[PDB]
Amino acid sequence: SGSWLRDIWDWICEVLSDFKTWLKAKLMPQL
């Protein structure tokens, strides 16, 4: 109950943002 699982996710969500920027910046092997 409350936001115990949401609070811990908020911090993990920010750490995942930079990880996506590294993968989104590259990608497109041929296209």
Swiss-Prot record:
Domain notes: The N-terminus acts as a membrane anchor. The C-terminus contains a nuclear localization signal.
PTM annotation, UniProt: Cleaved by host caspases which are probably activated by the viral infection.
Coiled coil, from the record: none
Top-level taxon: Viruses
Function: Phosphorylated protein that is indispensable for viral replication and assembly. Both hypo- and hyperphosphorylated states are required for the viral life cycle. The hyperphosphorylated form of NS5A is an inhibitor of viral replication. Involved in RNA-binding and especially in binding to the viral genome. Zinc is essential for RNA-binding. Participates in the viral particle production as a result of its interaction with the viral mature core protein. Its interaction with host VAPB may target the viral replication complex to vesicles. Down-regulates viral IRES translation initiation.
UniProt organism field: Hepatitis C virus genotype 1a (isolate H77)
Topology class, membrane: Peripheral membrane protein
Protein name per the record: Non-structural protein 5A
Region annotated Membrane-binding, chain positions: 6-26
Intramembrane region ranges (chain numbering): 1-31
Subunit structure: Monomer. Homodimer; dimerization is required for RNA-binding. Interacts with the mature core protein. Interacts (via N-terminus) with non-structural protein 4A. Interacts with non-structural protein 4B. Interacts (via region D2) with RNA-directed RNA polymerase. Part of the viral assembly initiation complex composed of NS2, E1, E2, NS3, NS4A, NS5A and the mature core protein. Part of the replication complex composed of NS2, NS3, NS4A, NS4B, NS5A and the RNA-directed RNA polymerase embedded in an ER-derived membranous web. Interacts with host GRB2. Interacts with host BIN1.
Shown residues in whole-protein numbering: 1973 to 2003 of 3011
Places the protein is found: Host endoplasmic reticulum membrane; Host cytoplasm, Host perinuclear region; Host mitochondrion; Host cytoplasm
Note: Cell culture adaptation of the virus leads to mutations in NS5A, reducing its inhibitory effect on replication.
